[PDB]
From a paper:
[name] ([name]), a superfamily of LRR proteins, is the principal receptor mediating innate immune responses against infections by Gram-negative bacteria. In this process, myeloid differentiation protein 2 (MD2) recognizes various lipopolysaccharides (LPSs) released from the Gram-negative bacteria, forming a complex with LPS at its hydrophobic pocket. In an attempt to prevent the systemic immune response caused by LPS, a [name] decoy receptor was constructed by combining LRR modules from the [name] ectodomain and VLR. The constructed decoy receptor was shown to attenuate the [name]-mediated signaling process by trapping MD2, implicating a potential therapeutics for bacteria-induced sepsis and inflammation.
Analysis of the interaction interface inferred that four residues (Thr-110, Val-132, Val-134, and Asn-156) on the decoy receptor were in position to make additional hydrophobic interactions with Leu-108 of MD2 when substituted for larger amino acid residues. In the case of Val-132 and Val-134, replacing these residues with phenylalanine or leucine might create a strong hydrophobic interaction. To analyze the interaction interfaces of other single mutants (M41E and [name]), we obtained the modeled interaction interfaces by superimposing their apo structures into the complex structure of the wild-type decoy receptor/MD2. For this, we determined the crystal structures of the single mutants in free form at a −2.4 Å resolution. In the case of the [name] mutant, the larger Leu-134 was able to have a strong hydrophobic interaction with Leu-108 on MD2, which seemed to have a positive effect on binding affinity. This result also validates our strategy for the design of variants with high binding affinities for MD2. Superposition of the mutants on the wild-type revealed that their original backbone structures were retained, which represents the structural characteristics of repeat proteins.
Residue numbers in the entry: 27 to 303
The structure:
Amino acid sequence: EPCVEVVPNITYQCMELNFYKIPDNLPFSTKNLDLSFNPLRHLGSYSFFSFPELQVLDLSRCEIQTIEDGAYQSLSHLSTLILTGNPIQSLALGAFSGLSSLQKLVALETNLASLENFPIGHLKTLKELNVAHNLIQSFKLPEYFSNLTNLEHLDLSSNKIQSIYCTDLRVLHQMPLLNLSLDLSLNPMNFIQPGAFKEIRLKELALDTNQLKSVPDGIFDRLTSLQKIWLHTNPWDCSCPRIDYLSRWLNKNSQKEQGSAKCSGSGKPVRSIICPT
Ligand SMILES: *[C@@H]1O[C@H](CO)[C@@H](O[C@@H]2O[C@H](CO)[C@@H](O[C@@H]3O[C@H](CO)[C@@H](O)[C@H](O)[C@@H]3O)[C@H](O)[C@H]2NC(C)=O)[C@H](O)[C@H]1NC(C)=O
Ligand SMILES: *[C@@H]1O[C@H](CO)[C@@H](O)[C@H](O)[C@H]1NC(C)=O
């Protein structure tokens, strides 16, 4: 059965077997399938009909370029789907149809340019969405996010986001509350419109290694749910009183800040700056 049997009728390692399609010489009760590094090129409808028992499918670096409507139509118990490294250049509006139990979607490096046309509007069970390392330019969350009521982890790091406007998180208002861990680090971000995190419950915020020089006063006021924040490796402008707010704040919430936001030029910790009144 060319793939390796990690666990009888359960787990198999088919990576780098030079497959052009999904194998059929595997038990139907399979739960974990790793097909990474196989030139699959395309995924038509019912490409996993002979695996209605899957829960974890790894399709990393499979050279997949398109996924037709109902490609995973069968897979009703798939929990984790890894598509990392695939040069996707076409995604059917029903490409993810059939995944009624998907909790973790990993789409690192899949030429994603807009969450707008990202067909995940029907995945209510989605807990983690990792779309880091992509071409996303805007942080404006599509209104279909109001349907992803279980989403507790969102990674948009290493994309092309330049700023965070008040409208971006609009949708997160007209929907249920939840512990959302947001990662927006490693972005060419240099602006954050005032009051963009109000009424928004955030557990963790990652804004490190961007292009931020300053942040609106009171940007992190009512975030009692906040536990971890990253702001280090940013060209912070510590002139006064422009840096007054962030100074005191980061100084009070010291145990929350991971790493240390430093002043450009001096390299002085922003937390240890005191602006005269
Ligand atoms: C992985 O799946 C295979 C099925 O292809 C398992 O082997 C099969 O085991 C069943 C028993 O569950 C055997 O079927 C029948 O079992 C009854 C038990 O009462 C017995 O009375 C019958 O005579 C008959 O054996 C079947 O023969 C057998 N087939 C194979 C593969 O030889 C295998 O055990 C599974 N491995 C794991 C993960 O346990
Ligand atoms: C969930 O959101 C999608 C996207 O707008 C919508 O089509 C659907 O009716 C909503 N409810 C369901 C059926 O999940």
